[PDB]
Amino acid sequence: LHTNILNRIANELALTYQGVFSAETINRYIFESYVSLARTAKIHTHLPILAEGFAKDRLHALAVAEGKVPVPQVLFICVHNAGRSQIASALLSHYAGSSVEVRSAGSLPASEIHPLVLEILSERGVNISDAFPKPLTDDVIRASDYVITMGCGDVCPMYPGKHYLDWELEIIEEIDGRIRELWKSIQLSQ
Amino acid sequence: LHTNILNRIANELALTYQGVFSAETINRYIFESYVSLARTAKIHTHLPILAEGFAKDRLHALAVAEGKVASPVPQVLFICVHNAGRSQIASALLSHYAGSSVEVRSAGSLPASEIHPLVLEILSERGVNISDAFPKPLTDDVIRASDYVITMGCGDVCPMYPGKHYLDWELEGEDKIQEIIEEIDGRIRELWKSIQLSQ
């Protein structure tokens, strides 16, 4: 059904990462991300878009982690990656622009973003395009200088050299507060 | 904690799969597998061990998918929602009839943290080995390796590769764990008879 486009996508990503990761690794990234998201979103017609965005962001994080690439890298984890971590990631990138790279993930991803998140967000001028629930993966953790867990519990490998923060909390309000402080603090630690 | 242990396992696996897969692939295999399991099972002191087992099985599946393993036996995969009941039952019953004559795998769309305790107890009571089993998510490498892929209520989560037998064994509510084991056993018997004949 999507084999051909995934193959063509893999080919294009493999070219992009030519001297950095082999085609083999690239192939695996694309097919595994596809299946990984299918598990919670089901096979649908938008899936190859989501699989490619996920694989692409995961590869750049891996390249970051392996010193192959670089601004500060922040990761937000909640359970479903539909509400909380999505808001927190949207607000940070809103305030910080391209001075940070911000990602989010879930331990138990929902099939879609919560109806309200998009867009109480645009109603505050806040960009949230190409947002989807996605599973937590290792590469994005390795990449991160800062990891903010938000009710997921103990799902995250503790890598040395990172700042791990736990945030126990419509709810966009409180998050807003904490994201502004966070950014202030991140910006200041450079 | 586990990061350093995981590093040791990747080094060892790098060297074992040298000539076959890129070290970069091998290293992702172990850490991604760990993180995958951690999502549903949580960090516990034995997560590194289950991750190593899962990675090693996954790398073998990928070796097979790509014809890097000579004379493979038939490869069968069962898939249900939580990889705690249905697929674990089916997988253990087929290994129990077939032994070394097939490689059997299972997986879930939404793994539980552990096998259903009653599954463990009932299979145990009738002498079916089920001991190193654990719920794990569906991954692409094991689909590619598989000659038979059997679906048991997971929904449309599984890509449809050519060269394979796709079987669907769940076309309100459900029966007692007891009865599901019996229905599945009946189906596993026919599947095993059929597999034996078709080779």
Side-chain angles (χ1 to χ4, degrees), chain A residues 1 3 6-7 20-26 28-29 31-32 34-36 38-40 42-44 58 62 66 68 106-109 135-142 154-160, chain B residues 1 3 6-7 20-25 28-29 31-32 34-36 38-40 42-43 58 62 66 68 108-111 137-144 154-162:
Chain A
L1 168 46
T3 312
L6 298 166
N7 272 352
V20 3
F21 304 119
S22 71
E24 163 189 290
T25 301
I26 304 291
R28 293 282 91 215
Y29 262 86
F31 286 98
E32 299 292 359
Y34 181 88
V35 168
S36 209
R39 286 185 291 92
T40 54
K42 281 46 196 155
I43 295 155
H44 71 285
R58 296 175 64 194
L62 187 55
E66 295 308 303
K68 268 152 175 184
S107 52
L108 307 169
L136 187 63
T137 48
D138 178 71
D139 36 38
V140 304
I141 307 159
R142 259 169 193 259
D154 204 10
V155 294
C156 193
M158 294 307 214
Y159 284 97
Chain B
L1 202 76
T3 283
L6 300 172
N7 286 330
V20 177
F21 298 127
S22 322
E24 49 194 57
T25 300
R28 293 289 88 208
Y29 256 85
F31 286 92
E32 297 299 350
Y34 180 77
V35 172
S36 285
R39 282 191 319 249
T40 45
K42 89 188 253 62
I43 305 292
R58 283 174 77 192
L62 188 61
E66 307 197 346
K68 286 169 196 311
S109 63
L110 307 171
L138 190 57
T139 56
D140 190 68
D141 36 36
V142 307
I143 298 162
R144 289 188 181 251
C154 49
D156 187 10
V157 298
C158 184
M160 226 60 106
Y161 295 103

Side-chain angles (χ1 to χ4, degrees), chain A residues 79-156:
Chain A
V79 176
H80 295 120
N81 183 226
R84 280 117 107 115
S85 55
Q86 293 281 352
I87 292 150
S89 166
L91 293 173
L92 177 60
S93 131
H94 177 78
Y95 289 119
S98 80
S99 288
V100 304
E101 318 221 48
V102 194
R103 301 181 170 90
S104 61
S107 52
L108 307 169
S111 66
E112 58 188 5
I113 312 289
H114 182 282
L116 285 162
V117 187
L118 147 9
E119 262 177 317
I120 293 177
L121 288 197
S122 195
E123 188 273 333
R124 284 161 66 113
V126 181
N127 179 67
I128 186 175
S129 309
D130 307 285
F132 55 101
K134 72 202 75 49
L136 187 63
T137 48
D138 178 71
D139 36 38
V140 304
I141 307 159
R142 259 169 193 259
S144 287
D145 297 308
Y146 287 83
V147 181
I148 299 83
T149 56
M150 320 177 65
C152 48
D154 204 10
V155 294
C156 193

Side-chain angles (χ1 to χ4, degrees), chain A residues 40-52:
Chain A
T40 54
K42 281 46 196 155
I43 295 155
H44 71 285
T45 193
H46 199 256
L47 194 48
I49 301 216
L50 297 190
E52 174 191 34

Side-chain angles (χ1 to χ4, degrees), chain B residues 147-177 179-186:
Chain B
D147 302 286
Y148 292 77
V149 171
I150 298 81
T151 257
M152 323 184 63
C154 49
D156 187 10
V157 298
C158 184
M160 226 60 106
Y161 295 103
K164 302 182 194 297
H165 311 289
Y166 287 84
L167 270 27
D168 194 336
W169 282 7
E170 194 171 328
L171 299 104
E172 288 177 17
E174 66 184 34
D175 299 300
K176 294 177 75 144
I177 294 302
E179 288 159 328
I180 294 167
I181 289 171
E182 315 271 49
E183 166 171 26
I184 290 168
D185 196 19

